[model samples]
Target chain A: MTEVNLNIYSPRWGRHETYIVELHKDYMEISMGAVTIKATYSENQDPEWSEETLQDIMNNDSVYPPEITQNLFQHAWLEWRKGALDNDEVTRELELVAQWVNKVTEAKPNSDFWRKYF
Target chain B: MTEVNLNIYSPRWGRHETYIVELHKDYMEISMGAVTIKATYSENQDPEWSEETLQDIMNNDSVYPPEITQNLFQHAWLEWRKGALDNDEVTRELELVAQWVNKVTEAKPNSDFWRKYF
Candidate 1:
């Protein structure tokens, strides 16, 4: 019902492509040209991923983007919602999303960022 | 009622904002966070800016983004229709647009890019 839009982009990734994020009530729709992701969080399995915690991250977020930071939590939240994706698997994916923060700030392409997801 | 979407963004300006371009049958709309340009082409004036020229630029576009390039031609086309923007004025406005391409690729924030018009 409610949505916020953010340009989840990396300069080094270059143009000829763009990434946009639309946050919906329960899910986040990330559109990257031909690719899109619906990261929905229904149930929480980790204390760190509680909606309150996610909202905390959004408010205190200065580094990276709220969308990216939000994505980090949501991705983990979704994993945990998936009946427990385990610790390392969730951590690993969270780290990958965290890496996106740098990819946007620094002038380097996380070349595989699209390849793996798309 | 055809629509094509493209992200028209300048990275150096930094984020917290995103731009989206929607191409419609008669007009091409360029949307910035709070600003949107409905570059509607109705009346024709200059031979150089024939819709054909705009279409040509779209097809052979390089160096700069097609949206920017298309904008340049369309902006000029709009002015010419306004009757008496003059060659110098049109060229001047067009030059300002041409500057955007460099601003995008070179990693320099066009601090004034958004200020002059918006």
Candidate 2:
């Protein structure tokens, strides 16, 4: 497994947040904010998928619909942007998408992660 | 041609530099500072390539030889990082790889881009 540690800081507040995204052969684990989300490729899918395909599968507006794995990833992205992070249009959009992910993932409302960030 | 505009800001300087990278069906045009660089795929290759393969082709330490397209892309990245951008190890390494790209691309030293950035 190869891990990429990304420290995304708000240019406005200088608040530094860290995320550890571990990419396995076919799955990924992202830990950020107050959540850890696991993502796996759809069944019978190739490990090496195109960016567009990944976007289609993972994006909130994806026509392919959100799966459990994509939901978790979105939730992580959303929580990271909304909590202790500066408000920017880009970040807001990212958070909105995360909400979509949470909704589709059937994630419990008023969840601890949700409360902590939102 | 759907394009995503990414604004990478320096956390320390609060310097907001914008780069317009246009992604077409199979190629990309990146405009930063005062340079415009273009990149295309390897021959006989599909439009959608894996990140690993794209990294293999574009990364300076890649086994694959630096193609003209990759060289331009690397140069753009290097100039963006080393110029008005902040100093960071990640940015430094990115510039180093850009040097390799320049070397393999047979790009001239004392070149406008070289002198402007480095």
Candidate 3:
């Protein structure tokens, strides 16, 4: 697990904000403000998944993490952007980190550790 | 002038922060928190530039913006990261946008409008 800390200026809040981003081998966690959102490399824990069928990619791929293949990673980030992080300018800023996280997950396509989680 | 608005989540703050990012043909402005930082494509308005001669990149390149050539874009952001946005996690999140801004500026190397400012 690798932890990266950041203190980025928020143009909307007119002040600096805090963020804690942790990248685990099988999952990524982002904690900002009151909410901590985690996106897993395996299954969707959200109720949305429980109510419906999982995406087709989940059934076929053991190599790539679902977060990268289905873009499930940004789902929570976007939700966070729309809800807790209500400022539009800040949303743009947040997406880059989210995207970077996805890229990192995408790079580990053949990770035995990550695939085990799937 | 092109203005992009975003409401991104802040993992540290646990809530959304506001941000207003403005991109002009020759300059970019980010207004967030208490201090709004502007990175110009042209001259350095900061006193640091007044204290000494600018880097060699400023001497010859009318084709590329100084923010990209000298990495001037992130200077104030780093300053802000250390001060008001005193969180390492958020700083990591912010650098990508700063880098992307630099790339955008870099792409317009031959722009007549950008070169005028350079």
Candidate 4:
């Protein structure tokens, strides 16, 4: 039920955009205005998710770069390996993801140029 | 001696600055211009260094934030836990530190303002 809200500069949108990021034990979701990206870590699907929606994502090209999600997951797993369980430090977990997002956004070309408009 | 060269925006510098970062088994160095920040993990000191230099660093306040160095060590330790030995992946080690520098820079308050000048 809880989600981390962050304002990110979307290269695809060419503007600053708000995104709702939800991280679970096995999967993650990065949602914008109308589109929700569901990325899974394993073959098992979340029971709450409809089968049709999963099929849609599987069939379509990833709206966001797969590397972004992959890197986030790797970072999370590395933290978990050190015993940062997602129980009490969920905020830290979300903040970690948020920081990763900022890192990617800042490194992109034209970031300095586009940041002025916002 | 091999060092990874990275151009970064320094808040204290008020402009983009070039830094040569070197990572070793028990310590690391982040050097720029005339100032070099040397951080060590163990109580033992590098034998090649004169005792006077180490005394100077110990006597003076850290020119750069210590947390920045601490966080970098923690990240390195976590990576080392995964068997990324410094033997073959030294470039990867430096790049990891470089990304971290970017992450911290991007999250700072005046990054956007200073970034505009570069």
Candidate 5:
């Protein structure tokens, strides 16, 4: 699981507020402590790709890993805004990113990778 | 088209090189004023939402605009990675956020809005 704390826009406050986002295997949970938003995964929704191919793409010399991570969230924002984010689809969309998180954890093991992404 | 100058990751230089990103009605173009990267829109690729509905959704009180804007780029990064970004699908994905760019340009007219998103 990947977890990090950041302030998201709280419309009620008309400013960003503190919250934590946790990405588990099946869902991405977001919250400010009192309440939580869970965007669950909808299986078979992503483009078809085997694990090897996804790995190869990330390994591409021309592609920078951080930029790809940055784009992942940008897409999530659009998908969420476009729909009130059905089932908090932001979590659903987080799957494409889940792999790198695992890759980092396996290598770094104890480092807080989530913090760097935010 | 919306244009803004920022530094993006350039693998060869190992740095975020300056570039301008332009979002047109159908495509997103990125250039360092050298080689340009264009991600064209793939037909029938985005979620189905009418103009009125999309407008309505953006205007919703619970949703904040900038966050949605941030998400737009995050999505672009992933789409680019997942493939060769096929026709630069980054440009294709930019279409979803195009309306808002026009909206800001119409309302603010002279301000550099893209700068805020980056």
Candidate 6:
């Protein structure tokens, strides 16, 4: 009998949501955003993998695709690990984003915006 | 003996302190910074002016001399009447002072100085 595997679905663009899938003897359905990525892993493993584990792997894979996903994941992971989303970090991120956006859009960043908030 | 009137000592520059004098006195001693302004009013006023009142008049006179003192007094009086010494007013006064200082000293005003306090 052919072994069936589970799948995971992680979103790349748009909103931040994930999903999971279970494989069967014949065919399986996977849904993620507009498209669904389907795959099967070998059933022969030392420890049995649960449906949840499969979902996690799929979600992680969705985020960290084989291409530049690893780098993106690493960067995001580092930022998360370091608690870089704190107030100061958010402020810095906002500044950097504004700078980049200004560079691209040719729109000047209103520096006094922070003052008004403060 | 000629009736000697009282005198007041008001400071023009340096520190903000006052002094007083008494009439019927051979010589009155008035000390205020480097120079001293001495004058005697008639002893026969409607009511006798206390040394404290004399001092106040002197101090006020120092800030607003006989010439431009009235205008400066009016401005300061208006500001005081309007409760202009509040935080916002102080901030504005500081800015005006800084601008004037910068203009006179040919130094640039460090605009970020207020941010440190805020």
Q: Score the docking of each candidate (DockQ).
A: 0.02, 0.01, 0.01, 0.02, 0.02, 0.01
Show where candidate 1 strays beyond 4 Å.
A1-28, A31-118, B1-68, B108-118
Worst window of 10 by summed lDDT in candidate 2 chain A:
A60-69
Best prediction by TM-score: 4
Which portions of model 6 show Cα errors greater than 4 Å? A1-118, B1-77, B84-88, B107-118
How would you encode candidate 4's per-residue C-alpha lDDT over B1-118 as one tens digit per residue?
3466755555555655666666665656756667676655555542233223321331132122112233333354434534554534545554554554455445532333223322
lDDT (Cα, tens digit) per residue for candidate 5, span A1-118: 5555553333234554454666555555555546554555556664222233222232221121222343444445445544644544455444434433333322221213212332
Q: Which ten residues in a row have the lowest lDDT in candidate 1 chain A?
A: A109-118
Candidate 4 C-alpha lDDT tens digits along A14-81: 56566665666565666666667665555454223323342133113212221223334334433443
What is the lDDT for B39 in model 1? 57
RMSD of each: 17.1, 19.3, 21.0, 16.1, 19.3, 31.0
* lDDT (10s digit) by residue, model 5, range B19-104: 45665546665555345545555556742222332213332212222323443444454344445345444444444344333333
> Among the candidates, what TM-score does chain A have in each?
0.36, 0.34, 0.35, 0.45, 0.33, 0.22
Steric clashes per prediction: 0, 0, 46, 0, 11, 4
Q: Write the per-residue lDDT of candidate 2 for residues B1-118, one digit (tens) a residue.
A: 4333433332223443344555453465655455555555444753333243332322222222222223334333333333532334324433343334333323212323222321
Error of 4 at A67 (Å): 4.0
Using all chains and alpha carbons, the TM-scores for the candidates as numbered come to 0.28, 0.21, 0.23, 0.31, 0.25, 0.15
For B29-118, candidate 6 gives per-residue lDDT tens digits of 233334433333333432222243322344344322112211222232233334544534433432332232122212111123211211
Among all candidates shown, the one with the greatest lDDT: 4
Once model 4 is optimally superposed onto the true structure by TM-score, how far is the C-alpha of residue A50 displaced, in angstroms? 13
Give the lowest summed-lDDT range of ten residues in model 6 chain A. Answer: A64-73
Q: lDDT tens string, model 2, A50-111? A: 33332232222211122222333344333333343233432443333333433322321233
- Chain B TM-score of candidate 6 stands at 0.22
Q: B35-102, model 3: which lDDT tens digit per residue?
A: 35555544545422221122222222221112122232334333343353333423443444333323
Residue B29 shift from truth in candidate 2, angstroms? 30
> Candidate 2: DockQ?
0.01
- lDDT by residue for model 1 (B1-118), tens: 2232333233434432233444333555544445455555554542223234332322222222323255344545454445545545544444444344333334321233112211
